[PDB]
Each structure stands twice: as structure tokens, then as C-alpha cells.
Amino acid sequence: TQSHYGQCGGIGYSGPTVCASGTTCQVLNPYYSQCL
């Protein structure tokens, strides 16, 4: 799982995309998605 302000997605990312409870995944740009 990811933590708050954690990268859940974004090109080049090869990690889990599930944000910690209480948060959600938010695409920042086509190369980064933060969890807020």
C-alpha cells in the first residue's frame, strides 16, 4: 500500500497503486500520480 502524499501511479511507476486508507489516488501529470 502507499502512504499519504505517496506515488500511486504515473508513467515509469512500477509500484502498487492503492493509497492508504483515508486517501485516494490523484493523477498529478502523465508521469506522476500522488495520493491525497
Side-chain angles (χ1 to χ4, degrees):
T1 3
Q2 225 74 28
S3 2
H4 185 190
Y5 306 106
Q7 184 161 13
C8 35
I11 302 180
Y13 185 68
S14 62
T17 61
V18 188
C19 303
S21 282
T23 30
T24 21
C25 195
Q26 305 194 2
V27 187
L28 194 17
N29 350 221
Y31 293 94
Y32 180 59
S33 300
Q34 191 148 32
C35 281
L36 310 169

